[PDB]
């Protein structure tokens, strides 16, 4: 790419790892700036430049550098990659905090993707944690869509993931939930398990004993449940597999699943996608894959 | 509900038990701001009267807890509290557009909040946005509340329906939780079947494994993340007992089923109206699996 993009108080000029590498290590080598990164804070300038080149390299990388009158250089701005979705992303050493640059420069990468980008949308993946981030995100018009559980190499537990996105036109139509229904003997004595081993929680139920009950994965309101339908017999039951993406670590969500009497597959096991996974099955036949970031 | 007598104290404001009758005049201000209440559930108030009754009527509510924003100057910006008759410790406020812009909203909030959390001994509190209410959102996340679900809601008073955020915060936020459930849908031809998801669904395949689809991942969004099933290949005899999922999706069932139709599906029929204010038709899949897709309208 070779336009550059300008604003208020800012020109973003298309990122030469070499060039630019010097003052943008005053960021991906400051400690603090990548308190949230994904790796930690760069060695050297060569590290750096390494990275960025490493950054800019993948497939769709679209990266700039921002530019302020005043000589400074805050730091930089673009769409990441390698990935489906436009991933989008910003950093600012310490000092140019503050200052309107992340929106101002966010703003910029933004306009540009969706209209003369030609793009059709636009993520951003921000932990749940980093607030000034998630304020920016939005102050730019990218909305939360999803969330992950993810773990960094070089952080002691797992994390959430914020999936925030933005269509250049919003699709009318679109699907909020997936609630799959699960046939099984005893409704209630189903709901008492689930509420122990995955700590769920009934959601409501029809009649006594029950016959008909929506288990929820969550305290709130909406969110990941599945309903569960009473059925007679003799009991042949074809089995039903669920994967279960869950937050935390493995080996407590399965000691949770074992300390509560459940059919667990054994100790949850690594895996090449990089989860650490363990199975639950339901005398019915059904069998839940929990997995874990770690 | 009860009683209350709590007065609720911060920086720059008082927290008054509200009181239906003596403030209404005030508070009309807000509720009866056709713009400040574009956002509301139902339309703004044609009088103090409407605002009296409606205040009143919020009042008696269940467990209702409200009150009333009182400024240092006497103004009256707004109200907020807890509502009653719901299931989780619900949260709502509103100030009048000439209170806007001083982060009042945010310290009453975050008052009725840091009280119900603390002081209620309340376990969680929930609070049900419209997607596009920016400035409510943008409390909500300068409180702490924190997203956790959408769901698509439809308003009489409204021609069309909409989303609603429902955002939360526990006092002592559980280490494991879930974040979502993805299903397996055993069917012969995993390719066809996401052709057809893609054409009714409105879905794209985020992954396939195997030349010949021995495995796919069918997202029922555009994004990394989000709603979305799996497709697992299997070849047989009278082949799969029917895997029953609820599809809560958002936008008018009768273009939903539009679109599975002209993707030349198998629906039951057209989207019908069920007791419980939605509008749904199920879509069954060659294998057995039905799916039914249910929307506020």
């Known amino acids: 790419h070779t336009a ?32 949230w990164w994904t790796r930690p804070a760069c060695a050297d300038p060569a590290e750096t430049e390494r990275y960025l080149t490493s950054c800019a ?34 950093l600012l050493r310490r000092d140019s905090w503050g200052h309107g640059y992340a ?11 969706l209209e003369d980008g030609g793009l059709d949308r636009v993520e951003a993946w921000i932990e749940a944690g980093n607030r000034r981030s998630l304020a ?8 939360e869509r999803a969330r992950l559980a993810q773990h960094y190499p070089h952080r002691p537990g797992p994390h959430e ?34 509420e122990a081993a995955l700590g769920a929680r009934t959601a409501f139920a029809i009649g006594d004993p029950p016959e008909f009950a ?10 990941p449940r ?32 074992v300390d509560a009497g459940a059919r667990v597959d054994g100790p949850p096991v690594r895996r090449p996608w990089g989860r650490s996974e363990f199975v639950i099955t339901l005398p019915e036949g059904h069998e839940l894959t929990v997995s874990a970031p770690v």
Do not use: Q
């Not at 800012?10 to 790892?17: A, I, K, R, S």
């Not at 920016?136 to 909305?143: E, F, I, K, N, P």
């Not at 996105?165 to 209630?188: C, F, N, S, Y």
């Open 136 to 143: 920016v995100a939005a102050r730019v018009g990218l909305t």
């Open 161 to 194: 993931m914020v999936v925030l996105g933005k269509a250049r036109a919003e699709e009318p139509l679109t699907t909020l939930a997936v609630i799959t229904e699960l046939p099984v003997r005893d409704v209630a004595a189903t709901l008492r398990l689930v």
């Open 4 to 35: 550059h993009l300008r604003t208020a108080r800012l020109e973003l000029t298309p990122l030469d790892p070499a060039a630019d590498a010097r003052h943008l290590h005053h960021a991906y080598g400051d400690e603090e700036v990548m308190r």
């Open 57 to 90: 390299a993948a497939p769709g990388a679209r990266l700039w550098t921002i530019r302020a009158p005043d000589g400074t250089v805050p730091g930089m701005a673009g769409l990441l990659g390698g990935t489906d979705v436009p991933g989008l992303t910003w």
């Open 103 to 113: 929106t101002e420069a966010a703003a910029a990468v933004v306009g540009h993707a």
């Open 226 to 257: 599945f309903r569960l339908a009473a059925v007679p017999g003799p009991g042949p039951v074809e089995p039903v597999r669920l994967h279960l993406d869950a937050a935390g670590t493995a080996d407590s969500l399965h000691r949770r699943a």
């Open 214 to 223: 929506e288990a929820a994965l969550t305290p709130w309101s909406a969110g």
